Write a protein that binds this ligand. Structure first.
Ligand SMILES: Cc1onc(O)c1C[C@H](N)C(=O)O
Ligand SMILES: [Zn+2]
Length: 258
């Protein structure tokens, strides 16, 4: 009956409202994905319940365990009916779950502390004083692990062996590390997140260089779900009406602190 939506606490997609302890259910959250979930549900005609993914991950398959974690896992093992989050459409994920056409276009980018002498991925690969890493259990880490292009392969070789670990559990952890490391740590994350953080106080970070790739976020459902068709049509309809652009402007720039 009520559609269980799995999502992740990642600003500005899903965040706890200031007054959340005094609110119930869906009303406890706010953000781009909260606004989008309400719209997808209206257009598809279903009631839903937002739930935060238990392990706080996007989703990756464990080598040997072979078990999918994160939001992807919630869909794969039937714990959730749909995932509405900044979840990247990738080949390994699409082999186990279905994705709508993209609701947001983005690419991996570099985040630096203002003043850091780095202008590109090539710059990072060619040096060692400035450490750099990515988020764990996601599409960004897999991009570097599977890349056959020289610069990225060199970056992966360094990242996989760096000590202490250059990988972080959450985006907020990556941003804090950039902010606290005096220019000695750069963070590789999706352009969407980079652009968002660039507009938040203390306004000390910035996106440098172009995107390393081009991809998109999709609304995900278990393979063969009855919801897939309507959800994809809803995403296409909402993008064409300008809603997705209005939502990005609202959560990224209208509320910008810089
Ligand atoms: C958001 C975000 O920003 N940088 C990232 O790697 C991610 C996670 C990425 N969207 C995923 O699906 O794994
Ligand atoms: Zn609508």
């Amino acid at each position: 009956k009520t559609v269980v939506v799995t999502t992740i606490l990642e600003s500005p997609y899903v965040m706890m409202k200031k007054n959340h302890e005094m609110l119930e259910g869906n009303e406890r959250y706010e953000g781009y994905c909260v606004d989008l979930a309400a719209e997808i549900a209206k257009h598809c005609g279903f009631k839903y319940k937002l739930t935060i993914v238990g392990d706080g991950k996007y989703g990756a398959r464990d080598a040997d365990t072979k078990i999918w974690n994160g939001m992807v896992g919630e869909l794969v093992y039937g714990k959730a009916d749909i995932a509405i989050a900044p979840l990247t459409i990738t080949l390994v994920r699409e082999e186990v779950i279905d994705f709508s056409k993209p609701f947001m276009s983005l690419g991996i980018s570099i985040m630096i502390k203002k003043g850091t002498p780095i202008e590109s991925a090539e710059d990072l690969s060619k040096q060692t004083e400035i450490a750099y890493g990515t988020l764990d259990s996601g599409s960004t880490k897999e991009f570097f692990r599977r890349s056959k292009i020289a610069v990225f392969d060199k970056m992966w070789t360094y990242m996989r062996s760096a000590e202490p670990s250059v990988f972080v559990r959450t985006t907020a952890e990556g941003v804090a590390r950039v902010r606290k490391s005096k220019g000695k740590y750069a963070y590789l994350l999706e352009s969407t997140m980079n652009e968002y953080i660039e507009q938040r106080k203390p306004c000390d970070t910035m996106k440098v260089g172009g995107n390393l790739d081009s991809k998109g976020y999709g609304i995900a459902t278990p393979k063969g779900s009855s919801l897939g068709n309507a959800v994809n049509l809803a995403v296409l309809k909402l993008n064409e009406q300008g809603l997705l652009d209005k939502l990005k402007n609202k959560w990224w720039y209208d509320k910008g602190e810089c």
